[PDB]
Amino acid sequence: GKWDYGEMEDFSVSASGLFITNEGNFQYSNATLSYYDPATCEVENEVFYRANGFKLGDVAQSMVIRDGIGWIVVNNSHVIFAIDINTFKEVGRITGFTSPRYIHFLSDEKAYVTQIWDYRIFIINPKTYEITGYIECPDMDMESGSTEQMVQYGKYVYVNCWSYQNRILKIDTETDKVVDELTIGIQPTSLVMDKYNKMWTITDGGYEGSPYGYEAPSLYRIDAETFTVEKQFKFKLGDWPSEVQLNGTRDTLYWINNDIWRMPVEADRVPVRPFLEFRDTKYYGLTVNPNNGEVYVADAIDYQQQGIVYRYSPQGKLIDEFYVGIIPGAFCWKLEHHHHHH
Ligand SMILES: [C-]#N
Ligand SMILES: [Cl-]
């Protein structure tokens, strides 16, 4: 059950819903997009292919919604697609990226797109669907370059550098230049900013046999104003953590480290018990509903079969679970009233 869908389908879905990107298997070009309606507990799978008649490509990595348009990063296809969020039809695309990762909008005419296998962050004009410039990251090359997730702090964007890197970088958006850096443990995976302007990042520890490193990974709380580590929470060699995520008021942190972990951002210590216990599968993506705190956990299972998403209440009770595509890795909320918080 994948592609025998016939003619293009005309979708008209709920004003409120949840996109799930599915990476597919790297180099097989079987990435897909799913759309879940939390009010009816119904999922639609392969919706980009069904609406457009052609496939997304290889490693759908992330997605952002802005002003009615969803922007889907297809990491191993050199492309970002822009789709209508109600019909899933393509409205445009930007090609020419080395290996794009995440998108951060500064205006209708300016966004940053991070990359792997490149030392540059690409600057785009989303209104004209063009690459307009580059930010050169210091002490990075094409052979092992990596920039990943982004958060904004005033006029600055902070970005974690993931694969074969060990830094958070600070970008002045007024000049499009890196102006500072912070070295931490190897391979920070993700980055969020809490309501107290503390950034959180968690590293993956590298891997056995890596030319760059293999070490016990850590979660870090970093002060954004002074760009300094406040506390390092070190885990165990052989753990491979990922994906810090916040709730909608940016006061409760979740992440993946076999189990799903949860901590108030004010806490001194990680709780003894996780939010969701490891079950001998592969928890791989994570999000929190910004309005009601429900926690969604994407499980790749074994990286081969169809993955599943679990939907839990903020108190840890299962609400629903639904099968998606292969290696579901990221989420994007479609909310009727745009949620922001400070
Ligand atoms: C692969 N990380
Ligand atoms: Cl699809």
Numbering used by the authors: 33 to 374
Mind quoting what the paper says about this structure?
Here we present X-ray crystal structures of B. theta BtuG2 complexed with cyanocobalamin (the manufactured and most stable form of B12, CNCbl), adenosylcobalamin (one of the biologically active forms of vitamin B12 with the bulkiest upper ligand, AdoCbl) as well as the precursor cobinamide (Cbi), which lacks the lower ligand and the nucleotide loop. The positively charged cofactors (Co is charged +3e)20 are bound at the same site on the negatively charged face of the BtuG2 beta-propeller and make many polar and hydrophobic interactions with protein residues. To investigate whether the lack of lower ligand would affect the binding mode, we also determined the BtuG2-Cbi crystal structure, using data to 1.35 Å resolution. The orientation of the ligand is virtually the same as for the other structures, confirming BtuG2 as a versatile corrinoid binder.
Contrasting with Enterobacteria, members of the dominant genus Bacteroides often encode several BtuB vitamin B12 outer membrane transporters together with a conserved array of surface-exposed B12-binding lipoproteins. Here we show that the BtuB transporters from Bacteroides thetaiotaomicron form stable, pedal bin-like complexes with surface-exposed BtuG lipoprotein lids, which bind B12 with high affinities. Closing of the BtuG lid following B12 capture causes destabilisation of the bound B12 by a conserved BtuB extracellular loop, causing translocation of the vitamin to BtuB and subsequent transport. We propose that TonB-dependent, lipoprotein-assisted small molecule uptake is a general feature of Bacteroides spp. that is important for the success of this genus in colonising the human gut.
